[PDB]
């Protein structure tokens, strides 16, 4: 019943080293083998690690396995780092048999130029009115690292409700995008002034306004 | 050469059962352990279990025992994942892969198969024209209220891609989906350059060519 705890997140610049530990709550780790596991997103994973100090072939050297039985724990250590080393690394060992995988842990790249987000606010369509529907559409581009809040205000009063926003994606470029709607019936657009998307990023804000 | 293919992804209603397959190729199919994995939208790896062809051999993690069945049908190199009764909770991404090479370790992956489980309904999209600083304006059109996913959106038949953007979709409370597509093009070409996003929804045989122009 162990489970395996790793850190959330780690960073580092490239070049230099990283390490990301993997401590189990139950029994000495020296017990069983443990492996890691390199997994990009949008792709399977890969064994980069196994039998705790092992490396497949394919896999830079520049990755290593360790155990350190003292504190109970195993460890990941990339040297020399680079960009594609970004990705997400589960430890995994084994409990009489069945598997055990650790929580996983974000690997940070640093040395990426900090960005603010480019926002682009759609009025509705004059068509999508004739359905007797109404959606706002806020655009959120270009931005780094990857957070954002999105505040919706009718003239000047904070709205909550008809509010759908995503998650960040990284884009092509390696910057983050973003996008929220408000849900509003035709009479609340003619209603109000004006609407506004408010888009804070690292403490500052940038806001886009539009009127019926 | 070694190889692990998996069955296409897959969108089903709560209820429905299911059975996913990873098909093995280029190896004696009975001697090596399969494992199979769950990678839920945006979390970590979890173990569901394991099998050894060769004599059905096979393992579950407790989190995942009764609650699904695996198995393996040696006379075509196929394990299999099924469900009797779908939740909307076993949406997530399912891995299978090879326990191999003397300590063995998951030597090949499977290419994963996603499953989408969804009370929602399938429908097609209503797409709403986005009309339009410098010498440089921003167009689009808002695909709404659609499902399942995939859409796919192109402007003019494939003809401009460049300053194009796409955004994920979201997830309502509905269970629909909507996104947004807006390209970016040099203002003098406004009026003089047609501009049509060409929206296909495969689930729904639907396809939609909304122009758009200036207010």
């Known amino acids: 019943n162990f489970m395996l705890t790793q850190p959330h997140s780690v960073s580092e610049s490239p070049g230099k080293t990283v390490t990301i530990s993997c401590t189990r709550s139950?029994?000495?780790?020296?017990?069983?083998?443990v492996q890691w596991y390199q997994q990009r997103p949008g792709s399977a994973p890969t064994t980069v690690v196994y039998?705790?100090?092992?490396?497949p072939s394919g896999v830079p050297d520049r990755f290593s396995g360790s155990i350190d039985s003292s504190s109970n724990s195993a460890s990941l250590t990339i040297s020399g780092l680079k960009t594609e080393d970004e990705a997400d690394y589960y430890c995994?060992?084994?409990?009489?048999?069945?598997?055990?995988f650790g929580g996983g842990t974000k690997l940070t790249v640093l040395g990426q130029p900090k960005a603010a987000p480019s926002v682009t606010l759609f009025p509705p369509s004059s068509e999508e009115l004739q359905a007797n529907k109404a959606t706002l559409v806020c655009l959120i581009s270009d931005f780094y690292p990857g957070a954002v809040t999105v505040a919706w205000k009718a003239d000047s009063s904070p709205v909550k409700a008809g509010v759908e926003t995503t998650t960040p994606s990284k884009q092509s470029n390696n910057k983050y995008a973003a996008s929220s709607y408000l849900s509003l019936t035709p009479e609340q657009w003619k209603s109000h002034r004006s609407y506004s998307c408010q888009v804070t990023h690292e403490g500052s804000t940038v806001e886009k306004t539009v009127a019926p | 050469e070694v190889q692990l293919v998996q069955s296409g992804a897959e969108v089903k209603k709560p209820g429905e059962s299911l059975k996913i397959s990873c098909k093995g190729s280029?190896?004696?199919?009975?001697?090596?352990?399969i494992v199979w994995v769950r990678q839920m939208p945006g979390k970590g790896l979890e173990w569901m279990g394991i099998?050894?062809?060769?004599?059905?051999?096979?393992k579950y993690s407790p989190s995942f025992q009764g609650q699904v069945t695996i198995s393996a049908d040696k006379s075509i190199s196929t394990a299999y994942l099924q469900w009797s009764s779908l939740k909307a909770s076993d949406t997530a991404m399912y891995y299978c892969?090879?326990?191999?090479?003397?300590?063995?370790?998951?030597?090949?992956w499977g290419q994963g198969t996603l499953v989408t489980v969804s009370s929602a309904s399938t429908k097609g999209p209503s797409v709403f024209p986005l009309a339009p600083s410098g010498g440089t304006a921003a167009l689009g059109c808002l695909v709404k209220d659609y499902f399942p996913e995939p859409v796919t959106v192109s402007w003019n038949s494939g003809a401009l891609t460049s300053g194009v953007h796409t955004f994920p979709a979201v997830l309502q409370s509905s269970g629909l989906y909507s996104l947004s597509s807006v390209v970016t093009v040099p203002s003098s070409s406004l009026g003089t350059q047609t501009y049509i996003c060409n929206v296909n929804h495969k689930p729904s045989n639907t396809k939609v060519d909304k122009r758009v122009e200036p207010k």
């Open positions: 099998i050894y062809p060769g004599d059905f051999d096979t």
């Open positions: 892969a090879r326990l191999g090479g003397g300590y063995y370790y998951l030597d090949y």
């Open positions: 039998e705790d100090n092992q490396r």
């Open positions: 139950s029994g000495s780790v020296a017990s069983d083998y």
């Open positions: 280029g190896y004696r199919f009975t001697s090596y352990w």
């Open positions: 995994q060992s084994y409990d009489n048999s069945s598997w055990v």
